[PDB]
Amino acid sequence: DREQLVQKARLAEQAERYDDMAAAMKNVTELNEPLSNEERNLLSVAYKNVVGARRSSWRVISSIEQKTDGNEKKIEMVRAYREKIEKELEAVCQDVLSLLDNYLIKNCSETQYESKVFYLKMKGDYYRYLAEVATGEKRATVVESSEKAYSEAHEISKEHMQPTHPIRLGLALNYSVFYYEIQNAPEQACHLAKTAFDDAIAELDTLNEDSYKDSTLIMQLLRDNLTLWT
């Protein structure tokens, strides 16, 4: 039953078993019904933790790879272990993108702008994670898919969401990170992050306590990135 799969995802989270948590929410998604905000958050938390563990391991191994000196034997083992982690990461991303393209984005009605921005941002995120580990021609393709997903989300969010909305702010944060880290375009990254920050400042006096906290949190990350980039 759907309610028990969602309970299973919450149980798996408490047990810190995020592979199980993502499997449970994948099953909920494949029931082909729209996700509530609570279910959508569980799905996002699950796969962020799953892919985040693969990303963290990849950066540790890749950093060691860029330090292995000239030893051919040691280089082959480290690089072969990096590739194994890489393929795990790519399979996780492929699972998320299929869920987004086949169920989540597809089932959004015309007036579900918030969900469209949420899922298109997610699509841009997971193509960006693919771009972090890709090289050569395979990199260019996922970079283009990432920019395309982010572009639609930003256009929808600018038209239909308040600049203070955490989803619009989080989109601008991750999109600017895409520009800086993936496209090596710091001028585009800095402009996008500063524009989003200034756009949110103009109406911060209007938030209540609960919205103020979520928005200022992402605004702090925008400011941290801008300081780092300058």
Partner: peptide
């Protein structure tokens, strides 16, 4: 590294 959400 830049911070994401």
């Amino acid at each position: 590294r830049s911070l994401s959400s």
